[PDB]
Symmetry: C3
């Protein structure tokens, strides 16, 4: 009825604002949304900002999701932090839920745990991953 | 249709979260959002009103703390909407009513030089009456 | 349920307002949003298209004035979507149709050096055909 008309007018308007939101610091892949803050921070600060924002750090679980996140990295020309760490068990990277990686896109020779102190993961402009020290400043990208 | 509205709040709640990052803060049904730049009061008041809202007007300790976070993130003191321009010494909201909450810094308000009618909020959340001509961070509320 | 859906329009209308501040402008059913930075035409045109829209395409004085404010706010001339790349002298929208509105500055378009095929908009709302390789403000429309 009349209400049914109100909602279809709403999805129309909402879909337009979805597009407006993701410009220029957002990327949607499936039902997941990546958004970057535009600046660089250490892991702990990046993880904090993302969690208080109601989400978490970028967690690519597929090639499609990895490609979408990659576009933000290319656009900002800055390697970004991922949520996965091997702090608990060295060599074994896990999501915040604790489960093991269901997808990875390591660069050649990575992860190498360089200096025996590389426990966080970053993504380059080519979409490849590298384990890097969590104290380094990288692009803050959250997922919602 | 009944399912579609339930599907809609789900998407909207997600878009809600995406929107407020990283320049927004929600406290209750109020939303603080910063422009990222500094302006004199008249321009700040202007930009917020044309945007469909008004300058940041914290009415509780919770709201003041949320607004404070936007200030800390930008490392820039921000303008509030309240002024004692009409009646000196008595600061009021745009509606004209008196302050229902205040967090003045020690010794403030002092009306320094006899020409301080606007209010700014520091990175520590404390308030200070400052000249309206000064450039401070633009933070609106919606 | 009807109360629940109108409660949704209320929340969306608020987030509508939050979204457009401070880099957005809505005129009619069109939304202009700026990226805040400058890029060459091809890069600007690219960013807009992958974002789900296209470059700023003012079709009326009302739309042109709204786009103008983003330019004023950033103090940087912005690229429009219209070009005379196909047939020199004949500017067209991405759809291929001829201009239904123009606000050319005095003496424009002049195709200076025989190599000006893109259009920029100044802080005064006037248009100028300029070389597409130049870096201008990126403003898209949705
Ligand atoms: O813009 C400088 C300073 O202004 C604000 O602090 C103010 C300052 O007053 C100064 C001076 O600005 C004023 O003209 C004379 C008038 O006799 O008094 C002082 O020399 O300091 C007082 C006391 O600390 C403040 O109450 C007053 O607001 C403030 O925005 C500050 O952040 C800023 O650097
Ligand atoms: O980036 C410089 C200037 O570009 C735009 O104005 C252009 C400018 O043309 C130049 C030059 O390229 C041309 O060969 C000679 C012809 O006599 O004129 C100028 O030296 O100025 C003309 C007329 O003023 C414009 O039509 C032309 O677009 C513009 O973006 C401007 O803001 C900028 O400074
Ligand atoms: O911060 C310097 C450097 O750190 C990272 O690369 C280091 C290491 O993690 C790699 O395994 C090796 C081999 O490629 O190179 C470095 O030692 C990267 O984040 C890199 O971009 C950065 O410059
Ligand atoms: Ca490790
Ligand atoms: Ca380790
Ligand atoms: Ca490494
Ligand atoms: Ca006074
Ligand atoms: Ca005063
Ligand atoms: Ca004072
Ligand atoms: Ca936004
Ligand atoms: Ca030509
Ligand atoms: Ca031309
Ligand atoms: Ca010209």
């Amino acid at each position: 009825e009349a209400l049914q008309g109100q909602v279809q007018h709403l999805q129309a308007a909402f879909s337009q604002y979805k597009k407006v939101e993701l410009f220029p610091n957002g990327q949607s892949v499936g039902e997941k949304i990546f958004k970057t803050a535009g600046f660089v921070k250490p892991f702990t600060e990046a993880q904090l900002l993302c969690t208080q924002a109601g989400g978490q750090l970028a967690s690519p679980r597929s090639a499609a999701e990895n490609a979408a996140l990659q576009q933000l990295v290319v656009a900002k020309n800055e390697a970004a932090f991922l949520s996965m760490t091997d702090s608990k068990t060295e060599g074994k990277f896990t999501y915040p839920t604790g489960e093991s990686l269901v997808y990875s896109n390591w660069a050649p020779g990575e992860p190498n745990d360089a200096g025996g102190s590389e426990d966080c993961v970053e993504i380059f402009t080519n979409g490849k991953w590298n384990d890097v020290a969590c104290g380094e400043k990288r692009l803050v990208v959250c997922e919602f």
